[PDB]
Symmetry: D2
Subunit: 116 residues, 4 copies
């Protein structure tokens, strides 16, 4: 799949399981249209969000519901979510892994971009 | 000022200077209304964004224009921007720190009294 | 394998390929004894460093030669290396993934620890 | 002072207070010789570690006792400590920033003139 999301929990040293992720694509009228969504697996991965044919050029937003994740663990975190906004496939189709590392008051996000 | 932003450059090991940051407050219709903005200083800071009286409880978004920063340095970046969305909750000072790399960023909140 | 190392390059958005990694284990006389070493693959992973039987309890150090990595890319980085020091298998055998995210003047390291 | 250390806590969103930090300088026989140490302040900083005259070129190691910090908070940590090893190279001020989580840490150098 050309778009995968991987989420890790920096407090427990584990995948972040059952984290909701929502993908949006910017429309011609500048609004965020829903594109795909899912939940992280026991491996912290969100697989199968899209296909090569559907994942056209565009500006995409991945919104990870980190607040609900921490709250279910008893923690009141700082952020409402972690959101990653990027232009995709501008120079041809690529494969994107969005990795997020979560702490209650901090997160990091990194992209690994590869050419199929 | 109850809200400060500090931006660092992980490639050059320096403050990220002249980066635009925009602050928005969520409105009743769930749209983002402009609240404050500025350009980071020589020390990578956005100062004077708001006041105690203005910075009431609510959901705020800080957008840092990282793409224009990397484009100025001649380095191809991944993100359009770095976004930090949080609820302000009543004394608390909020420092939003952002550490920038072309294909990665981290953001941390230091909330003090 | 109970000990894997994964290294990512935050400048290029890619695995960090051909990075040397050296593992040491603290000896009874408090010195760092060599334990294993290797180089990251095209996937940025260092596989096969040890075995379940050999990876006993102890204090381990993973030293990743980040300086040579950046230098070969034309960059003079801040750090001599990234080194991760931890107690392993204190409550029974575990599987450890040491992930490192590299920038010229910054690195992050995270451990994902799982129970087989 | 040409060398400052700042430590932040990513779980509580605060400076990491009362964290011990030790600075070592590599000796000719490749051993680590103690150079300076302290405990972080209320603001998470180690100040006054060295002077311009003392802080000559060489390889330095900063060891932050993160394990004792997390143990004080009652949180099981992964690392024995956070270690930052670097060559000081001739005006430059070095700020070593460390962002701590129980199973993760990041360190960044801000080098300014
Ligand atoms: Mg085109
Ligand atoms: Mg209230
Ligand atoms: Mg025992
Ligand atoms: Mg010289």
């Amino acid at each position: 799949c050309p778009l995968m999301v991987k989420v890790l929990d920096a407090v427990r040293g584990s995948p972040a399981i059952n984290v909701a992720g929502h993908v949006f694509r910017k429309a011609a009228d500048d609004t965020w249209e829903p594109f795909a969504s899912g939940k992280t697996s026991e491996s912290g991965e969100l697989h199968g969000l899209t296909t090569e044919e559907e994942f056209v050029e565009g500006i995409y937003k991945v919104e990870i519901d980190t607040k609900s994740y921490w709250k279910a663990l008893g923690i009141s975190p700082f952020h409402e979510h972690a959101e990653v906004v990027f232009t995709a496939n501008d120079s041809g189709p690529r494969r994107y892994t969005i990795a997020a590392l979560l702490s209650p008051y901090s997160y990091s996000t990194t992209a690994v971009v590869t050419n199929p």
